[PDB]
Amino acid sequence: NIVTLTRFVMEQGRKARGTGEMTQLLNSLCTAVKAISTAVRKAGIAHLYGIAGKLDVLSNDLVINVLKSSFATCVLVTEEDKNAIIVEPEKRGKYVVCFDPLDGSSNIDCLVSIGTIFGIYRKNSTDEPSEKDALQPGRNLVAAGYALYGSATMLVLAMVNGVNCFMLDPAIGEFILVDRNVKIKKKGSIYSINEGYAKEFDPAITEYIQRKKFPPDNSAPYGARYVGSMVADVHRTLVYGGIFMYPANKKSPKGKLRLLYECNPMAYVMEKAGGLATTGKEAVLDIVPTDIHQRAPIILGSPEDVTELLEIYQKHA
Amino acid sequence: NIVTLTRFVMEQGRKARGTGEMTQLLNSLCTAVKAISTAVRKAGIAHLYGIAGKLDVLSNDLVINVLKSSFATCVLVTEEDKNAIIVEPEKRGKYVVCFDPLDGSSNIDCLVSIGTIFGIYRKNSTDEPSEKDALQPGRNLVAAGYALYGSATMLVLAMVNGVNCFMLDPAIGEFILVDRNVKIKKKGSIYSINEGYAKEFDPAITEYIQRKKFPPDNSAPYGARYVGSMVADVHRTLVYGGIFMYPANKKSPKGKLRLLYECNPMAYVMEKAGGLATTGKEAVLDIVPTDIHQRAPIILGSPEDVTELLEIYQKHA
Amino acid sequence: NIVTLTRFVMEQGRKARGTGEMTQLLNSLCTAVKAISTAVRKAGIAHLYGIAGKLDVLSNDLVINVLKSSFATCVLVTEEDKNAIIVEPEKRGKYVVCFDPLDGSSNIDCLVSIGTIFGIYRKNSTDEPSEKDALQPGRNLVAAGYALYGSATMLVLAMVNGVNCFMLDPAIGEFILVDRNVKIKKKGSIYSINEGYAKEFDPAITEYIQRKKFPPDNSAPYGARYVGSMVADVHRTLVYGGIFMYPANKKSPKGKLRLLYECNPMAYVMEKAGGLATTGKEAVLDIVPTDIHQRAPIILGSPEDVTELLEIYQKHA
Amino acid sequence: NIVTLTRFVMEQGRKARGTGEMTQLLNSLCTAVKAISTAVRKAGIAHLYGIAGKLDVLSNDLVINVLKSSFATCVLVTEEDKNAIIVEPEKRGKYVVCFDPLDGSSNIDCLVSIGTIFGIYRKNSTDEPSEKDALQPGRNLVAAGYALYGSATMLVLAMVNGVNCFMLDPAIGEFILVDRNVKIKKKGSIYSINEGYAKEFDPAITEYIQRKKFPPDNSAPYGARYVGSMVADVHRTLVYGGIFMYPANKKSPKGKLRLLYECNPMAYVMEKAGGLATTGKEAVLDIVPTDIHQRAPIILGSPEDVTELLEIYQKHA
Ligand SMILES: Nc1ncnc2c1ncn2[C@@H]1O[C@H](COP(=O)(O)O)[C@@H](O)[C@H]1O
Ligand SMILES: Nc1ncnc2c1ncn2[C@@H]1O[C@H](COP(=O)(O)O)[C@@H](O)[C@H]1O
Ligand SMILES: Nc1ncnc2c1ncn2[C@@H]1O[C@H](COP(=O)(O)O)[C@@H](O)[C@H]1O
Ligand SMILES: Nc1ncnc2c1ncn2[C@@H]1O[C@H](COP(=O)(O)O)[C@@H](O)[C@H]1O
After folding, report:
1. How far is C19 from chain A, CA to nearest CA, in Å?
2. Ligand 4 lined by D232 (C-beta under 6 Å)
3. CATH number, span D182-316
4. Are C225 and D226 in contact (CB < 8 Å)?
5. Nearest to C10 among A20, A34, A173 (CB)
6. Which positions bind Mg(2+) 1 (chains A, B, C, D)?
7. Which CATH superfamily is domain B1-181 in?
C-alpha cells in the first residue's frame, strides 16, 4: 500500500471540491521537478564530451513551459526574468506562480545540493493580469514548497493543510510519500549563518551567536553547519531543528534573499511545520511587496530558537 | 576524443607495465561506486513502501564483495568493521584497501551530500595478510580518491601522476573525464570548520579564524562554509580553493577523523593537487599508524592558507 | 506542446465530468506499467547475481496492489489467479479490471517483447461484488489498452473517443503523447499467424493464406511476420496495417487466447482504431462470457483484410 | 562473485597475454552498446516533444567515434557507409571492425526488437589500410557478437573459446555474466523464415517447410516464429534451438543479408555455440569476400535441423 504524489494531489483536489485546475498545476510541477532532477544529475553529459561528435537557463525554460502548458497560470515570476511573465489568453488559468528554478546556480561547480523553490498565489484581481497579481503578502499563499536535488531528490509540499515530504524514486519516476504532516522540533541544536560576515553583523546576531557557542547556563554549544544553498540549509533546519539566519549585513537592511521566490515559500513551509519565520521585526509572510525581485532578511527555524533571538533583538532598541 | 574511467585506467596500466591486477582493482572500485550512487539516489524505494506487496551496511557489503571479486586484494579495512578483513586465499591479490563506505551516513535524512573514501596500499610484507599490512604511512599509497554523491556523482582519483575528476553519466553508467590533472589555487577564499566548538579551540586556530573575519589590513573576510560531510567540504576545497580544518578540540584531543580511511586519502589528494595537509604539527602522510581506526587532526587546503595557519601555530610554541 | 499521460487523463476526466475515480484508476495503471517496465528491463539484476552478497508473479502483484490502492476497483480478474480478486470493502470503487500482467511470459528467456493487456468495466449490479460482474461483453468496456515493453515502452489507451499512444521517457518517468487518435490502414500487406499448425487449419484459413502467398490478381505477395507475443503482433498490426490471426484448430477448438483479458481489450483497440475483430463467426466484442478464463478465436486488423477472410469463411458454409 | 563484462574481457586479455589493445577495443564496444541502448529506449524524448531548454545515424556515429577513440582500429565497415572508414593516422590500431549499427531500423516505428551486430578481424596485410583488410573470410574473425535491445538488453560475445551472454543492468550501466559457454540444442522445434516469399522459394526450402508442418513420421509439427529482425530471430534460435533461414529466392540468387556484418558475425556465434551456418552449398565462414557490401544466403541453427535441410539440398542437385 503506497501513496504517490499524483494520487495524493488528486485525493486532496477531490476532498476540496476543486475544479481540477490546481491539480493540473501541481501535476505539471511534479513533471518539471523530475526533468530538472535528471538534468542536475547530469544524465547525458557523455554527449557534450563527444561520445557521438546552461543548467539554470534550461531549468528556467522547463518550468515556464511545463506550467504554461498546464492551462492553469496567468502570471509567472522568475529569478532570471526581469519582468513578470504574462501567459497568453489561450493558456490562461487563474494561478500566479513565483519560483526560483535553480537555487544556488553558483554552487553546481562544487556539486553542492541545489534546489527549486515555488509559491502559488491565486489571482485575486479580475482585470487583465500583470505584476500586481504577484505582489501579494505570503500569508496569501495557497501552496508552496521546494525540491531539493542532493544525495537523493525530495519534494516538500506545504499547503493550508500541512507539510508532506515526498522522495523521488528515479527508477519509475514517482514521488513516494515518505514523511507526512511534518512538524519541526520546538528547539534544535544547530545554528546556520555565514560567519565570515561577522564584522558586518548587527548586535543582536552577535549576542545570539555568542550565546550559542558559549552558553551562559553552560549546557552544550550549538553545532554550526552552512552549506550555502538555501534549500539544503532550510531542509536540514526542518528535519533536524535549529535556526537558519540570512540577516542584514551591509547589503543594506534589504538582505540578500528575495521575498517572493525564496523567503516567502520557505517561511510558509516553516510556519505550517509549526516553526517561525521573521525579519527580526515583522513575520516574513506579512510584508506587502513593492517589487517582485525585492529582497528581505530572514531568520527561521525551531519555535524557541527563533523566539530567543527575537527577545535579543528587542533588547537593542 | 571522449575518455571514460575505463579507458583512462587501462591506458595508465599499459604505460606503467602493470600485470593488470591493479586495473582490475580500479575497475571493481568503479563498479562499486556506481552501485552505491544508485542506492544513495534511492532507486527502488517504492518497494520499501509496499508497491507490490541501513544504506551504509548495504554500502559496506557492496564495496567488500566487489573488491574481493577483483582477485586483487588481501586486507580491507573498513570504517564499519572493528577488525581488518583478511581475504579468502582463493581471491587473494597483493593490495590492501582502506575505505569509508559512506562518509557521514547521518547526512542521508537531511539529504546532505555523502561520499565514499578509499586508499590503496600495496602489501610490502612477505608475511601472511594481516592488520599490520594496513598500518603503513599514507606516504605509501599507490592510489587514493573519493566519490561524492552530490547534485551529481563525481569520483576524483589521485594517483602517482596526478588528480583527475570523472563525472558519472547515469544514463549509460560511465564516468567521463571532466577534469584533467587538477591543481588547487595557491590562495583560497573560504574557510571550513565547525565553529560551534569555538569554546574548545586552541589559540592558533582561534587566531586564524579571527584573522579571516577581521583581515589585518582592509581586506575582505573569507566566506565561511561547512557542509558537514568531509567529502563535500574537501571537494569544494579542491575545486574552489581555501582551507578545511578539523582540529583536535578537547572532546577528541587526537582529532575525530580517522587516519587510514578519511585523513590519508584526502591528504594524498590535496598533495597531488598541489595543496597541503597537516595536523598543525606534522605532515599527515608521514604519521606511522599504530591502530587501524586511529584518529588524526587535519588541516588541508591551498598552500598559502595552510601556511598562514602553520606560522600562527609556530608563533605559539 | 507536451502532453503527458497525467495531463491527458486529467483533462479527459474534466471533459467527461467524472468524479475523478476513473482518473485515479488510470493514474494507477500508469504507475503500474512503469514499475513493470523497470522490472522487465532488468534494473537491479546485479543484486540477484550477488553484487552485495519470477517476473510474471511480481507483475501480477504490482498490478493488484497498485489497483487496490486507487480505491477505484471492486473486482479484479488476472490471467494468473484462478478466481476473481474481490477488493476489500474499504477500498472498493465501481470498476472491474480484467488484465493480463505479462502477455507471453515464455518470451522472457528468448527476450522478445512482452506486454500488459487490460480492460475496464463499470460494475452496474447492486449485488455484493463477485466473479459475475466481470462476465460482461467487450462492448461494455469503459477503456482498454496495453503497454508494450519492446525496443521502447509504449502505452496505448482506447476509450470511446479514440486510440492514443504514449511513449515512455524512462529518463523522467513520464509517458508522452506521440500519436493522437490512431486509425489503422484500410488494407495492409502483412499477415500474422503461426503456420506450424497448418495441418490443423480450417479451409477458410487455408484458402486465405494461399491467396496471400500466391495472389489471385497479379499483386505482390504479403510479407509474413509472427513474433509470438500478442501485444507485439497486434501493435505491429495497429501501426503498420495488416491482419493478425489466432483461429481455432484440432488442439484448441475454442482458440488459445482468452476472451476477458487478451481478446476483448485488443478488439476494443482495433474497432476504435477503425479495424475489425472477429471469431470468424461473431464480432468478438458481443460474445457474452460464461467463464472468466474462457477462450475465443480472434482475427483482427485492417477492415479490408479481415473482410476478405470473412467472405472466404462465408463461401464455406 | 559476479563477473561484469569489464572484469571478463580484462581477465581473458590477461590470460591471452595481449598488449591491452583488444581489451581497449572490447571495452569501447561495450560503451557504444550502452549508449545505443539508452537512445533506443527513448530516454530524452520529452525534449523532442517540446519540454523546452535518424536513430540509425546516431547509432552509426556513436559506434564510429567510440571505436575511433580506443586507438585500436584502422578500417571500419558500416551498413550505413558506402565506403570503408579509414581511421586517421594517430588513432590507428590493428583491428578491422565490421558492424551493423542498428539491425532492422524499420522495426523502430513498430517497436520491435532491434540490435547491433559486430565482427572483429586483425589487419593482416602490411599496406596502408584499405577496404581490402575487411575482405577476409569469416573463419578469420578474432571475435564477433551482437547486442539485442529486446525486453532487456543483452550482449552476446563469441571468441575463440566460447559464446557468453551478458545481461545489461541499466541501473548501474554494467553488463553481468548470466550464461556462460553457451551451446545450442542439437535439434530445436521452431523454424524461422518469411513465408510470404513462398512463390519464390527453391524446392529444397519448399520441401523443408512442408516436412516441418506435416511431419512424415507423424511426430509434432514445428512451431513457426519470424520477428523480422535478424538479432531477435537468431538470438531466439541460440537460446531455444531451431533453425533460422533467409535463403536465395529472387533478391538475386544471393539473399538479402550481407556477409561481413550480418551473416559472418552470426554464423561465427552459431559455430562457437555448436550449431551450423551454411548458404545451402558452402559454410558461410569460408566465403572469401569480394565487395564489402556483399550479400549472402544463410541458414543457421541446431546441427540436426540444418543437416536435415542440407540432405534435401543434396537430394535436388
Ligand atoms: N489538488 C489540490 N489539493 C489541495 N487543494 C486543492 C486541490 N485542488 C484544488 N484545491 C482547492 O480548491 C481551490 C480551487 O481549485 P481549482 O478550482 O481547481 O482551481 C484551490 O485554490 C484550492 O484551495
Ligand atoms: N592502471 C594503473 N595506473 C597506475 N599505475 C598502475 C596501473 N596498474 C598498475 N600500475 C602500477 O604498477 C604496479 C603493479 O601493477 P600490477 O602488476 O597490476 O599489480 C602498481 O602498484 C602501480 O604502481
Ligand atoms: N480520465 C477520464 N478519461 C475519460 N473519461 C473519463 C475519465 N474519468 C471519468 N470518465 C468518464 O466519466 C464516468 C464517470 O467517472 P467517475 O465518476 O470517475 O467514475 C466514467 O465511467 C467515464 O466514462
Ligand atoms: N580481451 C581479450 N580476450 C580474448 N583474447 C584476447 C583479449 N585481448 C587479446 N587477446 C588475444 O591476443 C591477441 C593479441 O592481443 P592484442 O595485443 O591486445 O592486440 C588478440 O588478437 C586476441 O586473439
Report:
1. 8
2. no
3. 3.40.190.80
4. yes
5. A20
6. 79
7. Fructose-1,6-Bisphosphatase, subunit A, domain 1 (3.30.540.10)
